[PDB]
């Protein structure tokens, strides 16, 4: 339970303190992005490694679990530098690690950060995914909500307020969504 | 205080205005260089590197030998005009 708070605290203190010479480059970037209504941050791996190698080690071992924690840390900083409401911010990464040729990817690489290159050959249309979502309970007519995030979920079955075996339905009239797209790399 | 694009009335106008500027710059108030720099003086001493081979030249403070890609440690109040003319860089 406490580990989720220590990790968030660590990335929060990263953004608030990384100077190179005399400019707090991530505080300035995060402020300048909000003014043009861009809710994201472009972190660079080499700076993270320079600041504290342990954080990069945690990120390198379990990326599916740790990327959401760093994203919520960005939101917590974004409020302090601009409010005396905002969505959850998108984390974006840059790296210079060795490229893997696309033909060499195999079972040794599952759930690892990978850098590669190629040619885009196809693009899908946009489609909608849910982030904040509201729920109605069919029997008692009680209501609640859930927060999805898009890393590797289904509707729950613990009924509340007997209340039945599978009583939950979605209120699309009070829920939030985001864009998603598919691509093919050759 | 080159000419082909100016109309002839403009060609004499420019000469007239140059005469006026040098008249103001001369006489009383001569102690302040009205055509000099407008940026406040930051430092007395600077390091300047030699960009063009103008050879040996004279200036009110003294004589310089502009050996290409040599470097000077000198007071700015002297070399300000040579920086403006483009023989020197501040590095």
């Amino acid at each position: 339970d406490d580990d989720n708070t220590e990790i968030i605290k660590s990335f929060k203190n990263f953004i608030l303190e990384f100077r190179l010479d005399s400019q707090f480059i991530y505080r300035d970037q995060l402020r300048n992005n909000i003014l043009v209504k861009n809710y994201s941050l472009t972190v660079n791996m080499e700076h993270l490694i320079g600041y504290n190698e342990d954080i990069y080690k945690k990120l390198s071992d379990e990326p599916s679990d740790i990327i959401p924690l760093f994203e919520t840390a960005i939101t917590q900083v974004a409020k302090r530098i601009s409010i005396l409401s905002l969505p959850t911010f998108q984390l974006i990464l840059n790296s210079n690690a060795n490229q893997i040729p696309l033909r060499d990817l195999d079972s040794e690489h599952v759930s690892k950060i990978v850098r590669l290159s190629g040619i885009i050959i196809s693009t899908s249309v946009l489609s909608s995914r849910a982030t904040y979502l509201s729920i109605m309970c069919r029997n008692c007519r009680h209501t609640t909500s859930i927060t999805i995030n898009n890393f590797n979920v289904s509707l729950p079955r613990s009924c509340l307020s007997n209340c039945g075996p599978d009583p939950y339905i979605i209120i699309h009239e009070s829920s939030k969504f985001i864009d998603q797209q598919f691509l093919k790399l050759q | 205080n080159d000419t082909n694009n100016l109309s002839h009335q403009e060609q004499e106008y420019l000469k007239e205005y140059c005469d006026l500027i040098t008249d103001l710059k001369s006489g009383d108030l001569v102690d302040i260089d009205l055509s000099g720099s407008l940026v406040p003086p930051s430092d007395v001493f600077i390091d300047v590197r030699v960009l063009k081979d103008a050879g040996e030249i004279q200036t009110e403070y003294g004589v310089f030998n502009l050996i290409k890609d040599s470097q000077f440690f000198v007071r700015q109040s002297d070399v300000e005009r040579l920086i403006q003319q483009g023989y020197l860089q501040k590095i």
């Binding site: 100077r19 190179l20 700076h47 190698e53 | 001493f45 890609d69 470097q71 000198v74």
Partner: protein, 565 residues
């Protein structure tokens, strides 16, 4: 004139007094380009005089040809001039048209000391000196490591007695002193000490010591380790004391974006370890190639075999060293203790200096000097082309100079990127020389000549040629136990139709007692004095010469016929 360590302060006081006036540029520095130690020294001096508000000019110089030109044009109110990194071996009063009577201001009636309107100061550890410079030449003022006073009694005596002397007794005496001086002259070159080191002692004397100065000291010193290992080894302990002295209290505190540190820790004779990859660090190391014969597959397979036994997966050994896994990074210091012995490769382990500033990551002095050197080499009818080339090489001085500043790390990274390509191109020529067996094994010395190559232009610069020579010398030093021989290396140019020639010494292996001396100087000199051939001698390092295409073979024929080799 010469001064001792106990009297450097006095020259400094004299200079401050003599170059006082603000009306004129009363102080001039002449510095040899294409030398690192000279560069660093000059840097140090510049900072000192900066603090002292001494108006001055810095001029880089290529060689003797340029030296005369630059000296010629000097104004009379130039009360003081410094010669950095050259000149100790030659009579300066002979080299220039010096009449002392054109420069004495005042003769001190009491001392007999003549005060001159233009004073010339010299810094160089090349030996032996031209004796007049020490003894006769009053305007000339050079610094010595007590070497002159300690050694030269018979020679000093010989010089003065020979000068004073100007029938059986007279004949015997003259013959005697002729002998003495003849014995002293014409001995192989050697270079005994670091320029920057001497200046650091002066800074010590004044009280100007700081980490910015000490790091320059280390940098300058470090440049010697490749070629004059003995020197480096003599100097080294002093550096440890200084680093331990000036490092602050409360050590091993938490980082800050402002925290700077300098510390002693392991370093490896591996080519740029903390950049590129671990595998490339071994593969391009100048020492490893001599120890495992990497020019052929029976050598390369030994390297693969080593990493397999060390327990490092070969696909991770090729990853960029910054991104390589943390566990391997911290276990590497123990893995080498268990495995290098089986490959006869234990000499890889040593201690060195590492510096870091804030959050931007560590670098060692050994890596820094390679970056500097690379920037020197590759930074961006016949007489005009020569002129253009020589002028281009001087701009790289400033492209190097500006990289000594912590505010300009951007330029240093470019230097490192160039260093990697230079070593790659050197290795790809060395393998061709060995596999085609272009080394000719003459009885007295080893000869090698490059008639063609993938791009032979890279060897037109002296420094690059020296790097290739240094590669071949390690290979020749380890390939057989027998026959430590001199080596000659040459490269043609299609624009001049001239061969650029270098004469190279042997050397003893790293792990093993007087030093040897480079004798090519006298040899080259004597054949040049004799020969019909069209040749050039103007370089500070006399071991390097140039000659036209058709004249190489008669020159080398006369050279091998000579007994001076």
């Amino acid at each position: 004139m010469y001064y001792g360590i106990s009297q450097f302060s006095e020259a400094y006081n004299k200079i401050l007094r003599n170059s006082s006036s603000h009306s004129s540029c009363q102080l001039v520095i002449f510095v040899s380009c294409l030398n690192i130690d000279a560069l660093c020294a000059t840097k140090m001096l510049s900072l000192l005089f900066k603090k002292q508000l001494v108006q001055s000019q810095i001029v880089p110089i290529f060689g003797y040809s340029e030296l005369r030109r630059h000296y010629s044009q000097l104004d009379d109110n130039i009360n003081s001039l410094l010669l950095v990194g050259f000149g100790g071996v030659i009579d300066l009063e002979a080299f220039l048209e010096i009449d002392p009577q054109e420069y004495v201001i005042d003769t001190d009636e009491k001392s007999g000391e003549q005060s001159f309107r233009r004073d010339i100061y010299v810094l160089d550890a090349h030996r032996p000196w031209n004796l007049d410079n020490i003894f006769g030449s009053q305007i000339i003022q050079c610094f010595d490591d007590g070497t002159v006073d300690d050694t030269l009694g018979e020679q000093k005596e010989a010089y003065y007695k020979l000068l004073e002397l100007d029938r059986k007794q007279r004949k015997k005496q003259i013959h005697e002193y002729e002998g003495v001086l003849e014995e002293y002259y014409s001995q192989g070159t050697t270079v005994v000490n670091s320029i920057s080191a001497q200046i650091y002692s002066l800074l010590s004397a004044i009280g100007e010591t700081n980490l910015s100065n000490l790091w320059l000291n280390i940098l300058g010193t470090t440049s010697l380790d490749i070629a004059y290992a003995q020197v480096y080894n003599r100097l080294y302990p002093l550096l440890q004391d200084e680093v331990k002295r000036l490092t602050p209290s409360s050590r091993n505190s938490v980082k800050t974006p402002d925290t700077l540190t300098l510390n002693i820790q392991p370093d490896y004779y591996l080519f740029l370890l903390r950049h590129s990859s671990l595998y490339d660090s071994f593969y391009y190391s100048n020492y490893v190639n001599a120890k495992l014969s990497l020019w052929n597959e029976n050598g390369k397979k030994r390297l693969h075999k080593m990493f397999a036994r060390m327990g490092i997966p070969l696909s991770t050994a090729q990853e960029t060293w910054l991104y390589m896994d943390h566990s391997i990074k911290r276990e590497l210091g123990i893995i080498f203790d268990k495995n290098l012995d089986r490959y006869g490769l234990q000499d890889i382990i040593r201690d060195g200096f590492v510096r870091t500033l804030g959050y931007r990551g560590s670098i060692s002095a050994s890596e820094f000097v390679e970056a500097l050197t690379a920037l020197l080499e590759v930074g961006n009818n016949s007489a005009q082309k020569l002129t253009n080339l020589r002028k281009r090489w001087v701009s790289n001085f400033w492209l190097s100079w500006d990289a000594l500043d912590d505010r300009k790390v951007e330029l240093l990274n470019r230097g490192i990127q160039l260093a990697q390509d230079l070593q790659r191109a050197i290795f790809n020529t060395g393998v061709a020389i060995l596999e085609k067996k272009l080394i000719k094994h003459l009885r007295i010395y080893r000869l090698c000549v490059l008639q063609d190559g993938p791009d032979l232009d890279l060897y037109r610069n002296p420094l690059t040629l020296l790097r290739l020579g240094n590669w071949l010398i390690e290979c020749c030093a380890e390939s057989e136990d027998k026959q430590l021989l001199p080596m000659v290396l040459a490269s043609i140019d299609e624009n001049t139709d001239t061969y650029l020639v270098a004469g190279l010494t042997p050397r003893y292996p790293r792990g093993l007692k007087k030093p040897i001396l480079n004798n090519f100087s006298m040899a080259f000199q004597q054949i040049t004095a004799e020969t019909d051939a069209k040749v050039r001698i103007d370089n500070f390092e006399s071991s390097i010469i140039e000659i036209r295409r058709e004249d190489l073979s008669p020159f080398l024929e006369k050279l091998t016929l000579s007994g001076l080799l």
